[PDB]
Symmetry: D2
């Protein structure tokens, strides 16, 4: 593909899963993609697979790493067109009493402040290229989830911050958007399902958790990101739902039994 | 003892004869208002009159412009003012897949569920401006997030919620607020009768209760309390959609990012 | 050129403005496009301009026109992959007192029931192809607009109906989504501004209603439609905002503290 | 009072502005109100003025203060029915380049993590009383604001956290809701306008950002909070907008046609 040929993209948390789907979609559209991740195993494997991808061992919670990430991207490739902030962690299920303020702070560092720091340091270069920012949030930021108070809070912050940044950078023509995935299949999901008491039933339940009757794929998140970067020139501050309809009344009305 | 939160005020409730509408009537009567019930449901409207001296029933079809004109005329002639219009008239058809619906049926449903609200609101606005009154439209959560087997109904309630916001903008210079309430699953005597005919009534009742995080269905009185709030204490709210759903729209019942 | 190659797309109201931008975007993606519109000249002209595109003189409020649109599309191509319901009309500004029930009914016919009728007739073929429906709504269905009660109501209905249809047709793998444009610069926008007391000032207000400081283009709505048809395979029941950020932040909502 | 008579309410950030409006609303409804606020806040004066209000010198970012707040409330009054989390700060206008990660962390401590800590410590008692939580968020969490990246992020977090908490506490019958005010006229608003070169013009812009043509009052936020506590028994996880319609319609979002 050539929809993003000659462009340079940074993807944080790009080493596997959703992030790697985003990396792959951008490489397939002709872009040069810099993977910033602490997941060296996955980032190196993706670099091995995809000639247009470059892996940098990089922790978005460390300001020095982010500074080096940006300066190396510009040194090596001369420009920066798109930042995709996918770094972030979903803790295991935890009731409010099973969480701590210290853990909440740690999760805000990774899921929110890493996005903040990279976006801030990238903006001078994005202004030069009339580039754009894509934040990967979550449907649970919009409608909540049980047993995930810290995670939900961090993703509500990301979606709101996207809108604030969109307003602040609109005079420069720099768009800032987010994608909110629902249930996305990954190899990790498949491995965990195989250890359930009834894998067939657990898999079917996951597929039926949204109206489309299957889980999403990383490539589908990736295609949404390439759209936002390359063709959505009048979109800024939007939340693009990639959920298979999970937020719909599927929540089905019981106004009659 | 009659309450005083809306004492001396005059309220019109369309579709007020039973169910959600009657809960709204009762809430306003108990807040001290004179409430005019506009409905074709004479049985329910007359029963409410017998229970509630503060309510008055008028046989009234909001799809008939002459009926709406008579409704407003008579309300002003008898009671001298109009402070709040609650547009609750509306029908939910039985479940129908798209291929089981007709354009003619859809048009009929728009007449009852949307254009009746439009006609009454238009005719009431001169009087609402005089009283610095307000409009409350009863929509539905399904207008916001959809439901299966209800394309016409969902469309009509999406229209009501949007029209609420347009009207709020148009009437804001006059200080007339326009808001809507979107109920979720509300218990009624009809609901309880229908559940008894299900293959497993106990399971159907439990399913209905568990369809929202709060673990019960809502009550008409709760929709009524929300309407009294919007009329009497929400003076900086206009164009809002007040959800009365027990959390049904929330990520309940839920992420499967892990199996 | 190949993102949607070989796929059959129907666009109602495709003769000008937003609709023509959608038609052009789908032709550029390799699709075969059937244009349904009432403008003979503009429709024939697009057909002449875009090889492989087909124009049918077609009024979606007429059930016989809709039946012919579907039947002749299937007769021509044997398949139907995407229906884009863009037909619709925006009236001039009208205060509530200046609207009528009859005018409201006729706007519901144009803006809502045409979409309903075509979608119903198309769904059997869309199920066969695992195709999709794209409804063109408006931002004002979501946030309201002044002096537009009937229009706003029709677009709130379209957006809600999209979600209902998505729920009904997801068992068949048929996605149903909508695009909500904000201010898109078109001859229609220009014609509406010409009715204003100061057209230049109205156009400038329209541009400054977006944080981006410009209005959108038909081509941008068209690109969003091609995305929804060809690459948004896990999206159903969504409202894709193409608004330039008009819904964001505070702005001037009243004319000349608590 | 009597809408919330015999109940016990904690209001963080209750000393002035919106918070003081909430305190007064609950005292007027018959509740005993415990103010958690700092030394210079106004809370001590509210205790002087209002026999129904109690002031506790209390910084929600300090876990020991929050523990003392809850333990003293229970020791004195034996129950806790409602927690209103209004503590929070709006920084002056700041472009992204004028913000720091350290400042952002500090703002998350005050605006988000204080609400988290108090809610967690209050929940055993709210379960006993079938009480409720009200978080004061902001419209800008939903639609953004210019020159406020950290503030907007914190309020987006509060609104989302409200929904997560609603899901976690619905099994116990504990409702968790938020109020999102828009422009409310307060000393804080006036102080921010005074930073501007033309304060009168900034105030007029602030008034005209609402279709109603005015800003809101602390009392109007307070009335919304009393509704959520006392009458919104089928509402959980909602965002109650108290904004005067600021989110509705088109308005001026850029400064001096499709490129």
């Amino acid at each position: 593909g050539t929809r993003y040929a000659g462009k340079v993209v940074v993807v944080t948390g790009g080493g596997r899963g959703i992030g790697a789907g985003i990396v792959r979609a951008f490489v397939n559209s002709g872009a040069r993609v810099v993977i910033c991740d602490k997941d060296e195993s996955g980032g190196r494997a993706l670099e091995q697979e995809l000639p247009g991808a470059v892996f940098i061992l990089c922790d978005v919670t460390q300001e020095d790493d982010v500074k080096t990430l940006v300066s190396e991207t510009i040194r090596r490739f001369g420009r920066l067109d798109c930042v995709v902030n996918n770094a972030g962690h979903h803790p295991p299920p935890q009731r409010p009493e099973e969480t701590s303020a210290q853990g909440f702070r740690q999760l805000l560092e990774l899921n929110l402040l890493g996005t903040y720091t990279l976006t801030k340091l990238a903006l001078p270069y994005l202004r030069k290229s009339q580039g754009n920012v894509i934040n990967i949030s979550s449907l649970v930021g919009a409608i909540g989830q049980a047993q995930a108070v810290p995670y939900v809070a961090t993703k509500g912050a990301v979606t709101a911050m996207t809108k604030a940044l969109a307003l602040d950078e609109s005079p420069y023509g720099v768009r800032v958007n987010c994608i909110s995935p629902g249930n996305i299949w990954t190899p990790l999901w498949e491995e965990l399902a195989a250890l359930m008491p009834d894998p067939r039933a657990s898999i079917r339940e996951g597929m039926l958790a949204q109206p489309l009757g299957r889980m999403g794929q990383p490539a589908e998140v990736g295609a949404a990101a390439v759209f936002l970067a390359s063709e959505a020139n009048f979109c800024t501050g939007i939340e693009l739902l990639v959920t298979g309809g999970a937020e719909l009344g599927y929540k089905a009305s019981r106004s009659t039994p």
